[PDB]
């Protein structure tokens, strides 16, 4: 009986540790840098198909602006399944959504950083305002949208400058024009 109550707390504290971890990462200027450590293992879990995708911590356009996050598939998704690294942008249900203009219509720039500050993998896009990926969130997260063929799985395989110390850095820049 008392064994149950103890697990209860241990679980609740696990959640709090998660929340604090989340806050440690959120930004409010639309610029986000995501660090993915233990890459090799995560890359494996994706190839093996046990964990196809990973969500990044949430970030914002402003203190009370849109809530967003990124989603990556270390072994590709859709048209890039198995051949590319697929990177997507996600519009999340924010606390202040009622005060914001919809649909989300800010330009987004996604990047896989070269840890030798040389050739960064970059791609950008403007939202398709009719897409359900940019409608006001009804659930926790809208359908991710972005780049299925972001970067060839070879560009970050073996000896390359994107993977260093078994970690990669993804960067997102949300244009704040008009807000």
């Amino acid at each position: 009986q008392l064994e149950r109550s103890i697990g209860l707390k241990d679980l609740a504290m696990a959640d709090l540790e998660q929340k604090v971890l989340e806050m440690e990462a959120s930004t409010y200027d639309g610029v986000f840098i995501w660090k993915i450590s233990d890459f090799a293992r995560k890359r494996q879990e994706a190839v093996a198909g046990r964990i196809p995708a990973i969500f990044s911590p949430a970030f914002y356009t402003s203190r009370y602006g849109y809530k967003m996050c990124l989603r990556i598939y270390l072994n590709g998704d859709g048209t890039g399944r198995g051949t590319h690294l697929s990177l997507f942008f996600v519009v999340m249900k924010g606390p202040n959504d009622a005060l914001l203009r919809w649909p989300f219509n800010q330009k987004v720039t996604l990047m896989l950083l070269d840890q030798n500050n040389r050739e960064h993998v970059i791609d950008a896009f403007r939202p398709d305002v009719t897409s359900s990926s940019f409608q006001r969130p009804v659930n926790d997260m809208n359908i991710a949208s972005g780049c299925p063929l972001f970067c060839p799985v070879s560009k970050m395989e073996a000896k390359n400058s994107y993977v260093r110390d078994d970690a990669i850095f993804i960067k997102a820049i949300v244009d704040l024009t008009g807000l």
Binding site: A53, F125, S145
Partner: peptide
């Protein structure tokens, strides 16, 4: 143009 995840 953004492409949705599958």
């Amino acid at each position: 143009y953004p492409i949705q995840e599958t």
